[PDB]
Amino acid sequence: MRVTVSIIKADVGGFPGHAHVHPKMLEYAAAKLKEAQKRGVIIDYFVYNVGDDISLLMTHTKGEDNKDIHGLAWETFKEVTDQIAKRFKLYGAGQDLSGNIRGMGPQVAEMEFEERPSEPIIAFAADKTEPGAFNLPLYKMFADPFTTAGLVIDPSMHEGFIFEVLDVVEHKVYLLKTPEDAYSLLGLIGTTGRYIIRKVFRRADGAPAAANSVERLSYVGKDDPVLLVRAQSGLPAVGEVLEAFAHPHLVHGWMRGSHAGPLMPARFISVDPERRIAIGPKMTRFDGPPKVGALGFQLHEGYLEGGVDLFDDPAFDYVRQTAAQIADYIRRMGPFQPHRLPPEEMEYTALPKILAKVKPYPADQYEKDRKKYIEAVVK
Amino acid sequence: MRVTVSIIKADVGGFPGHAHVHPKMLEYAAAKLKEAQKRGVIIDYFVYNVGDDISLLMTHTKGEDNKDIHGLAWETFKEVTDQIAKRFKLYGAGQDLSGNIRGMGPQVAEMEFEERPSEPIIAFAADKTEPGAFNLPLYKMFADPFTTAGLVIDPSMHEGFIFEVLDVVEHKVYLLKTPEDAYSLLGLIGTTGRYIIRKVFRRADGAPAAANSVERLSYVGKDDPVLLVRAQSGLPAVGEVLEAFAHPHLVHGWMRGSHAGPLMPARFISVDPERRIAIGPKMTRFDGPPKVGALGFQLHEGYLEGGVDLFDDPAFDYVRQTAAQIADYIRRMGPFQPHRLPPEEMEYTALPKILAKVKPYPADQYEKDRKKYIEAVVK
Amino acid sequence: MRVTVSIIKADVGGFPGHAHVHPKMLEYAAAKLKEAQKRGVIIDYFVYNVGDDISLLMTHTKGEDNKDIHGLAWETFKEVTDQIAKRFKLYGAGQDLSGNIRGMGPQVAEMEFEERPSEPIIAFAADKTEPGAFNLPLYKMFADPFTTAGLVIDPSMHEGFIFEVLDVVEHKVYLLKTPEDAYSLLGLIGTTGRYIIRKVFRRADGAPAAANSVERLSYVGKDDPVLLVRAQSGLPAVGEVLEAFAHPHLVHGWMRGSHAGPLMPARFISVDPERRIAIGPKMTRFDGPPKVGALGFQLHEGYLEGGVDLFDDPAFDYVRQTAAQIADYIRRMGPFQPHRLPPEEMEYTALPKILAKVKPYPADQYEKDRKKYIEAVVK
Amino acid sequence: MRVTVSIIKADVGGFPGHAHVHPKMLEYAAAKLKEAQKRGVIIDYFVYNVGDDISLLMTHTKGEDNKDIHGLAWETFKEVTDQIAKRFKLYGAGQDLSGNIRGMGPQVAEMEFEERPSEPIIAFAADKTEPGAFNLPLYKMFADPFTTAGLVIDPSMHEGFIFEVLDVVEHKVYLLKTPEDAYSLLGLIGTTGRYIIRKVFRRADGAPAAANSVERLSYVGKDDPVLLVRAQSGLPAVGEVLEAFAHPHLVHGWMRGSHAGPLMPARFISVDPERRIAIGPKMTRFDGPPKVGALGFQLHEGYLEGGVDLFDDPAFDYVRQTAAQIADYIRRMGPFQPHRLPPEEMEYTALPKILAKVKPYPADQYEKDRKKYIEAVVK
Amino acid sequence: MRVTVSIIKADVGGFPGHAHVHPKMLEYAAAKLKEAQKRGVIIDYFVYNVGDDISLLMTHTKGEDNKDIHGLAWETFKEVTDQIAKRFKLYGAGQDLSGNIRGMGPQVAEMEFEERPSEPIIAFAADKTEPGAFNLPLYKMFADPFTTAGLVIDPSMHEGFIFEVLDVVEHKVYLLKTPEDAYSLLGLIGTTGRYIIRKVFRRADGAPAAANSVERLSYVGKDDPVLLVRAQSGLPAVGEVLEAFAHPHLVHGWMRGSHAGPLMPARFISVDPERRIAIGPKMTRFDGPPKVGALGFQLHEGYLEGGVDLFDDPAFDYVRQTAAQIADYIRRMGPFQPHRLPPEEMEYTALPKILAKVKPYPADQYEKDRKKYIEAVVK
């Protein structure tokens, strides 16, 4: 049978600040999805947060961009907002909020496909970063032979992959195929705030392999992303997917959406497959560092067996210790690029307030008058 | 009394991919063994996984290579397969599957002996590696005086040990005795994919000291191993056995059965001696690194008191941190030997697909024509 | 009121080997002491293990070297032996076993004193070492001004301490007073297997400050020790006591009682003040490394409020990581002094078996005949 | 003008063992090349060693595979052999020794081209490894966009490169073009002892970009390699070339040509551009670890201005410290794969001597007779 | 031809203390040996120190234990003593001082053999330790297959080696053969202050492979040692010899000859093969740590070409950093075993002075009187 897997994510209030979510928020969402499952709107679900973002993972048979599924997520987030976030005066209460949810603030990643005889999938959620944070891991798991050994040693993968790249500034899509287009592809997606991988397909048969949440920029579009990846059987192994996160690379976001810091692959605090709820990590120093969580599932008839925390291994403790030490190094740069983002990439700026108060001197005339201008400041 | 201890292990489905097992699989197996114990087929049992492999440890008085015990394991794995693995469409569902189970895919390690006045034993399980992963630890605990201090300072151990070595390619057995044969022995078992220690005996009296699961190659034979070791009282102390795993040496296996990486001695996630179930670690980056778990028991009248996780000590955290850092170093080699295995040792290859598409030039004629062949590629 | 605090410790069976104790052993002991408390034999108790040693801590008003208290401990250990250790065929079952228990194998540390208006005490237990393991920490906490800042900045401590030193070989006691006798004292207790601190008293008033379990050598006397220390109020602060364990110094013991390795200050696995039971750490690589646990109490009318695990702090994680790395370094020496102990200090040896089989040559005559003796070995 | 740059390298004696060369060897060679330059046989030269291998770098206008240039190198190595190596009884004296030198033992890497308006080149020499040691760095600098940023951001490099791959076992050449053929290429050159990059050309114009010394296997062919690379101006920058050595990856060779260990990028002990002599590093522990040296030049009219030691930077000290720590880790595996090489890849073996002395048992019959065979060894 | 290589070493004065030698001492010795070579007493020589010990290496054809060679060394050391050490009042001036020099204080290691077609040898010198410091490296390079890969993969080495072991207390020699006698051998040489390897021979042909300086104890015998090892060609490779020093194991010696600390493999400060002089490292913190230097040579007609500093490699910098960190760890134990040596192994003691001043109490009577003895100390 054909199944759709959809992640719809929003931040409708943090606890405290942007550090975490209130646990009653997850419990409310899970109860609401349980009711929807009872009415047959969806087949199955899982609810979790990383930081201050709640991801609603849902399986169903309504296809991509379905108004009922996008509305079910909208109503669940509006109800959490009124019943819990506003009640407790959470920070940023209801702030991510017919009939497509895309472009309103919440993030969506969805794929529809024929359910394979084994259907392993991984759901990722990152907090304190932008969709282009997943550019480097998506490139690596689908096109770097130092990450995905299948590209070289699995004859089923030799033909490579098709990347759908969205220019979020001019609203243009590019289709690039690896291996042959890898340098062109990199020329684009290296600019992570502009050219973002939105979907990946297998080149042999066109099968959907990943979907990243990304929307054109309009302030919406740099919101914290969610990502679905299918694995095995001509698609990267679960371990090759996870290998692409094993270097905690610098991403854009972190405090005030205006800095660069390492993406730490974090464990969940708890995973309860019966209650269908996982509680992800907090954001602390400098509102981060940015973190990504990974929950694995196996699908059957659309039922989600999982989730399984796939960064829960001593091997990833090395990678978390690297990210903790790189976060401390980079923070000693304070307000300066490239720790602070380029001026047109920062979410926060006071540059207009500054340039309104500080007097400029045309530089040619300034040369003749420097001595008197300094004497004036001195006196 | 004489008792047989048998480990029969299989992978009948992973969760997700090859990362872990579904916990209902262990619970089903334990219930089935509880029923068998009720009917007197076995005396006692313990069920656990490391990675995606479930080990059924059973004590009984039916001897080695018993059809009823091997059939009890087959039926338990077939029932887990139909009731759970196929139901949830687990990855590799039922894939390791009259009347000897050996050579069908599952792995068996068994020993029969007179139960000593104290009978401490350790059961090991490794995932993402081959039986020859245990060649270096078995050599060390029975024959390296830098590991087992008893060989030098315990007069009961001075005569050494007999190693039964199986050539899994030509199906030939060798018996070598240490100390005198140590260099010949190493000449063989250094080639870990060909010459594998299958059993070890005490030289003083011929008493069985260890049994490793290994079968001739036929695709079966490189499956993830299980190992039983008896300890103390003329056999290495429990700590000398565990010392032989304290260097996380490179083993063959890891992603796609085609790479080398460090064997990490891991803790179990949980050990429940009442329910007779332990849940072992997951495999994550690059489908590993490979890991080994160690559960200790004391036998009485064949009853298994335990298990006790014997890598659960801060001292082994150093060894796990070494393996995490060596896994990161070696992975930066990507597709190249010796991180990727020698071509006849890899489980995965696309070499036939490559050599079918890429044109060869006999090297002597190529010398005269190089300039035109390059001009042709250029134009 | 005057109270006696007594620790009586024994190993009556390990689980498996010498790695740990069976939890039913602790539960049996605690039930037996609960019954004794009901009959008024003792006031209060706490039962715990470190490694394979069970410590019975008891408060009562019967004084030091009391036959009823020493018999209560003997009967509790004999009952654990018959009901549990022999039943489960534990390793070394009942092996540490009228009317003084001292010198029979179990270890005793006891102090009687007037209960102070606040009476904080710490109970330590070490496994895989000898009583002289506590020589360096006892010296430091009572006489090193780099450990105990009170010796310099607390005028109540300026007069120092009296150390009672037992020569366990010739059965002689020495009383030495610090600061003035510190070099003589060190001349003795630096030889940790011969001269051991048994008790410490405050010099101002003669008040008992510590008691270490140590008996003359007879094979008994090197058994794993237990230690009581009173703190505060003219005695070292609780933190100065714990500071004296913050360097994980090399001790004698570890595998086969015949090696030197670092004393790791370990956490307890669990502390249950209501059930009056703590479960200490396991011994793993090479049957260790040696470890010490520390449980704090406050006494009131002899009741023991606690215990509190006093090595449970991230600051001691540094000290545990140092001990894990020093255990790995030293183990690469294998069979050689000074990792292996001096020949008269080792618990295990095969030297008589060796010297019975290997031919000696008087060294003067050997010089003339070397060439023919080598030609003979060669031919 | 057109110029040929040739490196001809040989080991004609070590000092001591295979650790280093005698400095008079370099001085003799440099004097002999000075004489040849005087007669116009060559334009310029530089003489250096890494370990026990002496590289003669020569520029001239006689083209590739020239008998006079190959004979000049042969006569220089034969003269060093008779005058110095045999005189001092150096180890392996004259052992690498009409009219092509290729396949006789010495290694040759040569390129002819039109000298560019700036012509920067780098000469590498590795000791204790095989030509396929340079497979991973050559792939990285010409085809990995994580190494060579020019592939993505330099439009002159976007078309990629042509790799000439020699199968040294069946004597077949393959031409593969990146980016499109990168997975096929890796499928071959990952097997470093069989498929070795011999030359690289620019795809835009066919210009020679690198040449590695490699010959078919015949015992000759695994000898320690030398490599020339041209840089800049549509070819990788000097820093991109050096970046491809910044991970000290495991190579085959080291002790007895039979182990795997990390390739350390080493400094030269001294570089004397006036005397035209550099003295490279020694090989010490375990006859290594394997090391590579890098000398940069700028060519003018064929004159060699340099050399410049291009691993002489604190940034490469990190990479040398990584290789020193990985050499210590891997050496603790001793005689076992994958530290010891696969049996058909090792230069040293005693397997025939072993199999001549150790009795085999056909494995089927052995099963019935195990008990008596063990009783026989025991008795 | 047959050649003898002799090292005769002495400390005839330190500069300052025991830290180093005065450079004029080496220059005087080298001039005196140059004169002896002129008269044909010796063929060749090299003079060097490690710490405060000067080694005279000499080749000649007078055989082992030659009065003229031993007298030439005695006269050179007596002349250095009178002309330089006494003149400058060096510390320990002339203190190591017919007709065998052995047993008078200086140390001798010598071997005579037929000079092979290549004859590589290594001379070692250790300061601040005892001859048994070389027990662990000599065992490893001749009998541990984790050090010397030739024992397994070189059929010329398969028969192993003969160790001549001197009991320096009872003056008895033992001959033990590896592999078969390795556990007996270790049972002895693990006790490094009693059983010391004096010579090693090849078992195939009886050829001398190493000689360590060691004399019976009489105070003489624990003096800082010197060691000659021949390498290659059925004897361990130069790198296998050096691998046996790559773990900086704890040795006895260091301050006052009474402590244990790590043996650091050190570089020489300078090596001048023309002047025939090397200046070794200093001893600093705590008069060490103990250090060993290694100089390689190649012999021709008895001429010594070298020396070459064979610990001069970044790979050994890791090993020196390990020894520096282990020296800091162990020194925090201060006066306690096992950092301080066992009482009968220390060169320094004040135990008689202590036991003369501190009053003993027979331990049985002390029990009754403890309270009054403490009251007496208190009052």
Ligand SMILES: [Mg+2]
């Ligand atoms: Mg927020």
Ligand SMILES: [Mg+2]
């Ligand atoms: Mg967020």
Ligand SMILES: [Mg+2]
């Ligand atoms: Mg599997």
Ligand SMILES: [Mg+2]
């Ligand atoms: Mg598995």
Ligand SMILES: [Mg+2]
């Ligand atoms: Mg015990």
Ligand SMILES: [Mg+2]
């Ligand atoms: Mg114990």
Ligand SMILES: [Mg+2]
């Ligand atoms: Mg050589």
Ligand SMILES: [Mg+2]
């Ligand atoms: Mg070489």
Ligand SMILES: [Mg+2]
């Ligand atoms: Mg001196």
Ligand SMILES: [Mg+2]
């Ligand atoms: Mg000295």
